Amino acid sequence: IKQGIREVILCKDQDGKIGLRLKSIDNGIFVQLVQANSPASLVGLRFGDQVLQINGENCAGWSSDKAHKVLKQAFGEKITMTIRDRPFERTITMHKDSTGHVGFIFKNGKITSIVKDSSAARNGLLTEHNICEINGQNVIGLKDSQIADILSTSGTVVTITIMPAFIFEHIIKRMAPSIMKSLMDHTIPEV
């Protein structure tokens, strides 16, 4: 989670999509969903990102509907966006033990308990937090099994990006869980 603004230039695909859905939160605009294999995924927009401007114009106070509206009504040539990096999220680094544990319990993405003497404990991982990413990979909507798998497949060092459930639950609100499982980009970034 970078402590700054950045600018991205987008470019509508063949079909005029950018692969993005936006949600209005506390009078800003935030990324609800990034589609795999989209301009938005390529330029590296992330779930939880804040859109400050689109094509120079400020986003504050906009409705989800109007933000979508704007995106359609724009000379796709290039769309310029100004992005505060996942403002509602923070990242914990952790280390696996001899028995390959970081030391917490989660359910539906949400962390429900921390284990005594764990690395989860030493680093102050918090409960009532929905898991957003792991080692830089968005794991939202995956099953608990596949999340467990990623934590298993991951090295000893494990980096998790978490968000307060209340905020998480308000971002994903009005989006079907299948779409998150299906369409939300769950891939490592390209170089």
- For residue 11, the domain's CATH number is 2.30.42.10
Question: CB–CB of 154/148 below 8 Å?
Answer: no
CB 71 within 8 A of CB 45: no
- Using DSSP, state whether 123 is helix, strand or coil: coil
Elucidation method: X-ray
- Residue 4: burial class (beta carbons within 10 Å; 0-12, 13-18, 19+): exposed
The rounded distance, in Å, linking the Cα atoms of 120 and 118 is: 5
Looking at 59, 84, 109, the residue that finishes a domain is: 84
- Whether 39 is in a domain gets the answer yes
Q: How far apart are CA 154 and CA 32, in angstroms?
A: 26
Q: Of 84, 103, 118, at which residue does a domain stop?
A: 84
User: Which residues does the annotation place in the binding site?
Assistant: 108, 143-144
Residues 75 and 119 grouped into a single domain: no
Question: What residues form DSSP beta bridges with 6?
Answer: 83
Residue 191 is assigned to a structural domain of this protein: no
- Could you tell me the residue range of the domain that residue 96 belongs to? 90-183
Q: Kindly state whether residues 95 and 178 are assigned to the same domain.
A: yes
Q: Is residue 105 domain-shared with residue 75, that is, in the same domain?
A: no
Q: Which of 84, 102, 129 is the last residue of a domain?
A: 84
For residue 157, being part of any structural domain is answered with yes
What type of residue sits at position 115? V
Closest CA to 135 of 143, 144, 147, 126: 147
- In this structure, are 48 and 127 located in the same domain? no
For residue 189, the 8-state DSSP code is P
CA distance 1 to 118: 24
Q: Are residues 76 and 119 in the same domain?
A: no
Resolution for this experimental structure (Å): 2.2
The number of domains in the chain is: 2
| Same-domain pairing of 103 and 163 | yes
Domain assignment present for 72: yes
In the chain, count of helices (H) and strands (E)?
Answer: 6, 12
Rounded-to-5 percentages of helix, strand, coil across the chain: 20, 35, 45
Cα 130 vs. chain centroid, distance in angstroms?
11
